[PDB]
Amino acid sequence: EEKRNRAITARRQHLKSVMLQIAATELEKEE
């Protein structure tokens, strides 16, 4: 019940970490 939301926030925090990578990666290829 509250375990889910714990997971929900986790997954979300993770995706944001991914965003930063995708961005970073793409910013290097710009060379």
Binding site: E2, R4, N5, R6, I8, T9, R11, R12, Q13, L15, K16, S17, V18, M19, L20, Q21, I22, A23, A24, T25, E26, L27
Partner: protein, 158 residues
């Protein structure tokens, strides 16, 4: 007063979890907990202030000095701490991610642009996922997210 802000700054599932821990140390059942329990409750929800920092906090929230704090007080503070403790990218680097994310360059990142992001990743982001990311990120509710809103959402992220 300046509470609803702190409430807004936190997601739905966060305030839902924070309560859980809070309520946990609330025997009085009065939506109240002892300041001698703060440090430990804050530990359950990720925060790790140094004992000296926990003392500062206790001084701020409980100024009049009764030895307890409510949940709205917990919120307002938890949020400030979360922010203070932040250790994410700076403005400069975060703005560059932004322009990578804003394909049409309208000053926003929209639902569609959002899913356009995880495509470069080998992950599977559900429709709701995309919607929740935008949900917590969306604060004026314009349906999208601007830079300043992108900052908050990226606050101390690794």
């Amino acid at each position: 007063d300046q509470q609803a802000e702190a409430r807004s700054y936190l997601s739905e599932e966060m305030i839902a979890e924070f309560k859980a821990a809070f309520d946990m140390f609330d025997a009085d059942g009065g939506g109240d907990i002892s300041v001698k329990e703060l440090g430990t409750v804050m530990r359950m929800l990720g925060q790790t202030p140094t004992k000296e920092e926990l003392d500062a906090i206790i001084e701020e929230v409980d100024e009049d000095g009764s030895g307890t704090i409510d949940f709205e007080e917990f919120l307002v503070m938890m949020v400030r701490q979360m922010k203070e403790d932040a250790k994410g990218k700076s403005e400069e680097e975060l703005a560059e991610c932004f322009r990578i994310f804003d394909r049409n360059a309208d000053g926003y990142i929209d639902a569609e642009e959002l899913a356009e992001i995880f495509r470069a990743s080998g992950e599977h982001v559900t429709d709701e996922e995309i919607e929740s990311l935008m949900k917590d990120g969306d604060k004026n509710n314009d349906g999208r997210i601007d830079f300043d809103e992108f900052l908050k959402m990226m606050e101390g992220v690794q």
